Design a protein around this ligand. Structure first.
Ligand SMILES: *[C@@]12=NC3=[C]C([C])=C([C])[C]=C3N([C][C]([O])[C]([O])[C]([O])[C]OP([O])([O])=O)C1=NC(=O)[N]C2=O
Ligand SMILES: *[C@@]12=NC3=[C]C([C])=C([C])[C]=C3N([C][C]([O])[C]([O])[C]([O])[C]OP([O])([O])=O)C1=NC(=O)[N]C2=O
Lengths: 128, 135
């Protein structure tokens, strides 16, 4: 009763269109704007990867990239950057929205800023 | 290990037929719609976005069923309703849709997610008899 219990804050979510080449962001909640610091215009049309930066863990990025292309739902905690250049730890959950026949045309992303000590716990788990 | 998200679950059981409304905006207008909702209703994105979902309703739509959602919506309680909707061409179908409010850190509903589905005639009769029980 933790990983899901805390993460439950859902006002931070995006929707992406997989039918467009780089699975770009087609919708972002105002909460996502608040969290990331970006305007709607500087988000829409872009792959969510733009939040990442120098100190972002590449091996973590690889894990979700694979999860997404394989269509499996997963969550991941990695280092993200705001509009201004500050960094927060992002625990986000990505889930593919399958049509009646099982094809993914949209994806849901739910983002969460997590504390330092919780991030350390989540990252170490990923290091296995 | 993995979350039981109100939003994620509502969406996964949606069958690519859903919308997102913005509660902060006047009259809780649709700010996103899946292609599934597009084909179902016959409207284009330009004919949908910025509008309240009530535009799918018409002369025969049960005003009682409508009252049910309106109430559940103002009280921020998740519910599903089966009412008669009208496509852009004016043909009718029975819509069984589910709506769930999304709250911010302060508990305020800032977004709604709706999940619509066309139901067969025989199935509708069932859902409606059940619906009528509370009266
Ligand atoms: C971003 N959230 C997010 C939400 C959705 C629904 C999807 C599909 C992806 C993300 N990403 C992951 C990112 O876009 C990309 O998939 C990964 O970087 C791996 O692919 P690449 O090609 O870059 O190796 C999110 N990434 C973030 O860093 N933060 C989020 O909140
Ligand atoms: C519409 N789906 C739908 C989805 C969401 C997310 C929300 C918030 C509402 C709907 N409506 C209900 C409608 O917009 C309105 O809230 C009710 O009619 C009651 O309000 P009013 O002020 O009009 O009495 C949906 N209505 C439909 O008829 N069909 C759906 O698919």
């Amino acid at each position: 009763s933790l990983v899901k219990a805390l993460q439950m804050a859902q006002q931070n979510f995006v929707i992406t269109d997989a039918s467009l080449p780089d699975n770009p962001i087609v919708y972002a909640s105002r909460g996502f704007l608040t969290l990331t610091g970006y305007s709607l215009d500087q988000i829409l049309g872009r792959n969510c990867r733009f939040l990442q930066g120098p100190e972002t863990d590449p091996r973590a990025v690889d894990k979700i990239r694979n999860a997404i292309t394989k269509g499996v739902d997963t969550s991941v905690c990695l280092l993200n950057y705001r509009q201004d250049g500050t960094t927060f730890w992002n625990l986000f959950f990505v889930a593919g929205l399958r049509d009646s026949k099982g094809n993914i045309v949209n994806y849901v992303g739910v983002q969460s800023k997590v504390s330092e000590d919780y991030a350390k716990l989540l990252v170490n788990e990923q290091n296995i």
